[PDB]
């Protein structure tokens, strides 16, 4: 019942500072422009200990499945090959990606009827808000 409140189909409704976050990550111009336009749907489901987060947009379809605390390979939407670990910390899903000696953390939490996604790369934060589809 660990992630019950995250389960469902979610649609992006707002984004702040995402271009600056992507710059900090190292995303190139053309990908930042196209990816910044996208309004992904995120589909979250749980089956036993396995959590799946699928994202569908006009830019890319991506999918991760994982067990909390157990590192996995992820190819990100911007084509980074990263090593990811996702844990629950006080009800917040905390997703750390490591690649090329770099690190970024993505936190997902329920706030009212929203699912709020905070993406941090060094000093730069972007906030992306999803509502139920
Ligand atoms: N499947 C996905 N499409 C996008 C589009 C933009 C983005 F920032 C993340 C994702 S994941």
Swiss-Prot record:
Residues where a fatty acid binds: 128-130
Xref: InterPro entries: Calycin, Fatty_acid-bd, ILBP, Lipocln_cytosolic_FA-bd_dom
Keyword vocabulary terms for this entry: Acetylation, Cytoplasm, Lipid-binding, Nucleus, Phosphoprotein, Transport
GO cellular component terms given for this protein: cytoplasm; cytosol; extracellular exosome; lipid droplet; nucleus
GO MF annotations, alphabetized: fatty acid binding; hormone receptor binding; long-chain fatty acid binding; long-chain fatty acid transmembrane transporter activity
Short motif (Nuclear localization signal): ranges: 23-33
Pfam families membership: Lipocalin
Keyword Acetylation: yes
Modified residues (Phosphotyrosine): 21
Effect of residue 24 to D: In a breast cancer sample; somatic mutation
Function of the protein: Lipid transport protein in adipocytes. Binds both long chain fatty acids and retinoic acid. Delivers long-chain fatty acids and retinoic acid to their cognate receptors in the nucleus.
Assembly: Monomer. Homodimer. Interacts with PPARG.
Name of the protein this chain belongs to: Fatty acid-binding protein, adipocyte
Organism: Homo sapiens
Gene: FABP4
């Amino acid at each position: 019942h660990m992630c019950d409140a995250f389960v469902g189909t979610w649609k992006l409704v707002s984004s702040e500072n995402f271009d600056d976050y992507m710059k900090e990550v190292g995303v190139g111009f053309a990908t930042r422009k196209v990816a910044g336009m996208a309004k992904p749907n995120m589909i979250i489901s749980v089956n036993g200990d396995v959590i799946t987060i699928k994202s569908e947009s006009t830019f890319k379809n991506t999918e991760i499945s994982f067990i909390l605390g157990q590192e996995f390979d992820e190819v990100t939407a911007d084509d980074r090959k990263v090593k990811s670990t996702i844990t629950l910390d006080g009800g917040v899903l905390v997703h750390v990606q490591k690649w090329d000696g770099k690190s970024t953390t993505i936190k997902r939490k329920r706030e009212d009827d929203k699912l709020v996604v905070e993406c941090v790369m060094k000093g730069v934060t972007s906030t992306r808000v999803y509502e139920r589809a």
